[PDB]
Subunit: 49 residues, 4 copies
């Protein structure tokens, strides 16, 4: 049982850490797109008068 | 000139606030997708033995 | 054993969901502080000439 | 006037980009703290039986 509980707990941790990395990267990528969005909009507004 | 500077500054602020809202919503939506991702993966792992 | 594995898996899920909520709230709160930061800085810059 | 508008627009852009960097870093740092939080909690739960 302790064998199981030790294993299932460590599986939980590994799962959570994997998801943390995937999520941290997905964030970075969103921030990248948002910065491109801000640039286009600022330029589009500057061009209008 | 002061008329301009007052106007262009306020335009900056409004732009930044708009982008803040759009970005805050895009975040929420990402967090939603990530939670669905975690659920599917956890279920897929639980089903394997 | 299946009793254990079912229980430990569900504990994993509940832990992950709890952390998801706590983290989503911590984000919201950061975004709040960042918006206050942008306001102060914009005002401080506008005041300088 | 065009001199002003060109300058104030570029100031807007630089401000927004600076805040983007500061904010992206503040995020990274939060994600770091959250990962430490998850580790402590998981360990604290594993220790209880």
């Amino acid at each position: 049982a302790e064998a199981q509980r030790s294993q299932l707990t460590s599986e939980c941790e590994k799962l959570m850490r994997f998801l943390d990395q995937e999520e941290r990267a997905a964030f970075s990528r969103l921030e990248d797109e948002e910065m491109r969005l801000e640039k286009r909009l600022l330029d589009n507004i500057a061009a209008l008068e």
